[PDB]
Every structure is written in structure tokens, then in C-alpha cells.
């Protein structure tokens, strides 16, 4: 039953990830998973209730894998801790299943207030950290963390939404990777 | 039929800009408005319907009043600065605070509400942006990334600022982040 349960999400997760949340049915995620209708019910009573679930796994992941290519970059101050962490998100965002699944359907699935709740409780931390340490290096000016924290999510999450649509990924990944890092460049005391 | 129409957005504009759009039905705003039901039906299939029709109304005075205010406050980098105050005084009027802060995005999406927000403020972000490194105070760079992540981080800033515990303190902190931001950008 807990087996049920972990093959399910796998399943949709896979084929949500794949061709989205609309193009795939819970009788086919049943199949894939190779288990009965009943059990699905009896441990998601909906479509979007296993999507949720879907939801906070790859969102786990996105954040490990960004501590991931943090701690690969070799960055030897907060300053250029912050630097890896941007490059990292727009690596990660880029990542088709989460294009797919974090910033196509969950928005559109979750509402607005329950993915902004989703978004927030796995950034805010890690945003608000990289900022405080930051101000303790004396490599940011003593502000705010909080306001700070959340306007530079909101630019950052424009960002990746920005790329995900664009008519040409690629050069907009690039250029707006150029923009972000002006600006950090333009806050940062080295 | 279109008097009917502007009577209509008239009228749920006052109302829901009062109490929300969850709080106010489509056959209270019908009577606000002097026109019957099946007038309004005809006009507007329903609730969300005439709602996005609101937006369209609030944004283009949100525009306007906007170049009013940057016209009014007296260099293309004092320009930027003077935009971003009016954009903070234009989101705490309670109206826009209800209408597009809190309720366009749960009613449009979030992707129906990039969308409206992006069509009206694009154009001025980006010229804003051509001025400024025209007059050689800000890097030569690509022009839409830029506005596109501008207008991320201010749309986010007034969010911020209509939803906080202490607004009066939100707005104050947020406008020192803000100026921070603008000024790492900006050649001085």
C-alpha cells in the first residue's frame, strides 16, 4: 500500500513529466504503476491530489540538486556562492520535466496561492541564507532579508517563466542569464 | 449594448474593488448597474467573464496615471527612480490593491495574469531601459530580458507589500531594496 502509493507518483511523474498534466489520464498512470483503480483511489481521491504529491518530490529534487551544483562550484565566498546559485536555478529549470511540471501545470493545477505556497516554502530558506551570509562577509550592504529574499525570487522565477515560453530557449536562456548577472554583479561588494 | 456593457464595469469595479470578488455576486452588481439579468448575460457569460474586462479598465488608468506621476516628479536613471516610487504609490491605492494585487491573479492565472501585466507595462519598461543606455547610464544589454525580469521583481514587490503584516514597514523596507537594485544597475 505504501508501495502503491510511490509507484503511483513515480508513474505520473514520469508521463505528466513527458506530456503534460492534460494529455495523461489516472487509468493510464494506474496501468503504468500496475496496480488497480481501488488502490489509486484509495490513496489519492483525485487526479490533481497525486499531482500535489508529484509536485513536493520534484520540487525536493530541484532544491538538492541546486545545493548539488552549489557545493560543485567551488565557491569560496557567499558572494560567488550566489553567483553558482543563479546559474544553477536557470540549469535546473531548464530540465524539460521541470519545465513541464513546475512551471506549466502546477500553476495552472495548484492555483496561484497554493503554488506560490509550494514555491515559497522550498526558496525562501535557502534565498534567505545565501543573503544573510552575505551581509556577514560585508559582501552586501545590511538590509532587509525577507523583502530582499522575495523581490529576488519573484525576478528570478519571472526569469525561468520567461525562458520556458520563449520562441528561441536558448538565446533566451543566455541573455537573460547575462541580465541576472549584471544585476547581482551591480549588489554584490565582490 | 455597449452602455450596458460600461455600466456593468462600472459597477463591479466599485463593488469588488470594495469587497473582493469572492464577496460580491454578478446580480448584486446587475442592480448597482440598472440593467437586468439577461442584459448582463448576454454581455457577459459569467462572473470571470466580466472581471477580466475590469482588468482591462484598471490597468489602462494604472498606465496612465503613471506617466502623469513620472511627468510630474521632474536624466533617463531619475526617470527609472521616479517610476518605481509611482508604482509603489499606484499599487497602494486600495482598488488596484484588491483588484490586481490579490484577486487578477486568482482569477486569471498566473499566466493569464503575466499576460495582462506584461501587454500594458512592457512597452514602457523597455523605453525606459532605451533611454538610459542611450544617455549612456546604463550597460548596453538586451533590452526585453531586462524589462521581463524587472517586471517579475516589481509585480513580486507589490504583492509583498498589499499581503505584509505591517504594510506602512513593508512598503518603507521594499522601497530601500528596491532603490538598491535600480542603483546596482544604474551608472552613477
Avoid: C
Wanted: proline share 4%.
Amino acid at each position: 500500500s505504501a508501495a502503491t502509493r510511490e509507484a503511483l507518483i513515480t508513474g505520473a511523474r514520469k508521463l505528466w513529466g513527458l506530456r503534460g498534466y492534460a494529455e495523461v489520464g489516472t487509468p493510464e498512470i494506474a496501468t503504468e504503476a500496475g496496480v488497480t483503480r481501488g488502490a489509486m483511489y484509495h490513496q489519492f481521491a483525485d487526479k490533481a491530489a497525486l499531482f500535489r504529491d508529484v509536485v513536493e518530490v520534484v520540487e525536493q529534487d530541484v532544491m538538492a540538486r541546486m545545493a548539488t551544483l552549489v557545493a560543485a562550484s567551488g565557491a569560496a565566498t557567499p558572494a560567488d556562492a550566489i553567483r553558482a546559485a543563479v546559474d544553477a536555478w536557470l540549469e535546473v529549470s531548464g530540465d524539460p520535466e521541470v519545465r513541464q511540471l513546475i512551471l506549466l501545470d502546477a500553476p495552472v493545477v495548484l492555483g496561484w496561492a497554493g503554488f506560490r505556497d509550494v514555491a515559497q516554502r522550498y526558496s525562501l530558506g535557502m534565498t534567505e541564507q545565501l543573503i544573510t551570509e552575505a551581509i556577514r562577509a560585508g559582501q552586501l550592504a545590511r538590509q532587509p532579508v525577507r523583502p530582499l529574499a522575495q523581490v529576488l525570487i519573484g525576478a528570478l522565477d519571472e526569469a525561468a517563466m520567461f525562458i520556458a515560453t520563449a520562441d528561441d530557449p536558448k538565446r533566451a536562456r543566455r541573455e537573460t542569464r547575462q541580465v541576472l548577472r549584471r544585476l547581482i554583479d551591480g549588489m554584490l561588494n565582490g
